[PDB]
Amino acid sequence: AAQTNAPWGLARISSTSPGTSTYYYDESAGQGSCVYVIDTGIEASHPEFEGRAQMVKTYYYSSRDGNGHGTHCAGTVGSRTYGVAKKTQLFGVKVLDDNGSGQYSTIIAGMDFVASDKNNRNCPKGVVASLSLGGGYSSSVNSAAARLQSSGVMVAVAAGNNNADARNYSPASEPSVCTVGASDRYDRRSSFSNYGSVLDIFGPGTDILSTWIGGSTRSISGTSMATPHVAGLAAYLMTLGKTTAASACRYIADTANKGDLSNIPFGTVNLLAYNNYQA
Ligand SMILES: N=C(N)NOCC[C@H](N)C(=O)O
């Protein structure tokens, strides 16, 4: 399938070169997979989600996304226009308040929730969790992410936005999950992207158009935007049968575009997520 006039990041993940604007992908499109978006919520009524999104858990007075961040990230995973995996099922877990803030204890509870809740969902092709959040190093936060991964969920986490080594942030620094840095449309490391040995992969993160609350759209930047590209890619590849939740991060690294990003510090991987789709 070909989506013309796609957001640059979608075109990038199906291309061997920057500077194109059509997204190419197998029509299976993540059907039969599920992606949990652990964030500020999801505006599931947005027409872009086509009934495929739902809130399953909140720790606050509402499950609605009063911020926009979680809706944007969910749109990059799986919205019809802005999403990588256009037929996946999206499940929202609201661990962040409407200002985008949340306590680590709530975030940990949300991760353990997903590890169990997947057993209440129909995801025959596999389960992914996208975590566009983080803070300072916490062994307990890292352990929660490791448990979620161990339970059979492909965990993708944002590297962070400090232009610093991600070893000092969680869950970014957990070795067993997929830690995602951000790139721009010219294949440069995004100016804010964290780096370091703990990164596994880069995805599009600067000037990313996606869904927003109020049935709207907007372009924003962050490792939060790169992470759902990778989460959606994992769901797409799992539906194709090319990999599994346990192996998807490594498979994405194996099959990435290699050596194409600029301003990658010595010792950080130079790997850009790529779907290797041939029409
Ligand atoms: N991945 C390799 N080696 N070839 O695929 C070509 C890309 C194809 N134009 C697409 O539909 O994206």
Task: Report whether 244 contacts 173 (CB < 8 A).
Answer: no
**Which pair of structure tokens corresponds to residue 126?**
């596999």
Choosing from 27, 236, 277 the residue with most ligand 1 atoms within 8 A of its CB, the one to mutate for a pocket test is: 277
Distance of CA 233 to the CA centre of its chain: 8
Beta strands in 132-189 (DSSP E): 135-136, 153-158, 169-170, 178-183
**Which pair of structure tokens corresponds to residue 39?**
């964030």
Which of ligand 1's atoms lies nearest the C-alpha of 276? 1
Residue 186: which region, alpha, beta or left (left: phi > 0; alpha: psi -120 to 50)? alpha
Instruction: Output the CA 14–ligand 1 centroid distance in Å.
Output: 7
Helix (H, G, I), strand (E, B) or coil at 96: coil
Q: Number of structural domains, the chain?
A: 1
| Burial label, 6 (beta-carbon count in 10 A; 0-12, 13-18, 19+) | buried
Q: Domain of residue 261: give its range.
A: 1-279
Gap between the Cα atoms of 209 and 189, Å rounded: 18
Q: Which residues contact 134 (CB under 8 A, 6 or more apart)?
A: 141, 157, 158, 160, 169, 170, 171, 172
- The length of the chain in residues reads 279
**Which pair of structure tokens corresponds to residue 65?**
């996304």
Residues annotated within the binding site are: 16, 175, 177, 200, 260
Instruction: Output the CA 119–ligand 1 centroid distance in Å.
Output: 35
Which of ligand 1's atoms lies nearest the C-alpha of 274? 1
**Which pair of structure tokens corresponds to residue 50?**
């086509």
Strand pairing class (271-272; 257-258): antiparallel
- Could you identify the residue written with the tokens 């339970």? 151
CATH number of domain containing 114: 3.40.50.200
Resolution of the experimental structure, in angstroms: 1.0
Prior bond to 171 cis, omega within 30?
yes
Distance of CA 22 to the CA centre of its chain: 20
Choosing from 20, 22, 24 the residue with most ligand 1 atoms within 8 A of its CB, the one to mutate for a pocket test is: 24
Tally helices (H) and strands (E) across the chain.
Answer: 6, 15
Residue 212: strand pairing partners = 216
Helix (H, G, I), strand (E, B) or coil at 195: strand
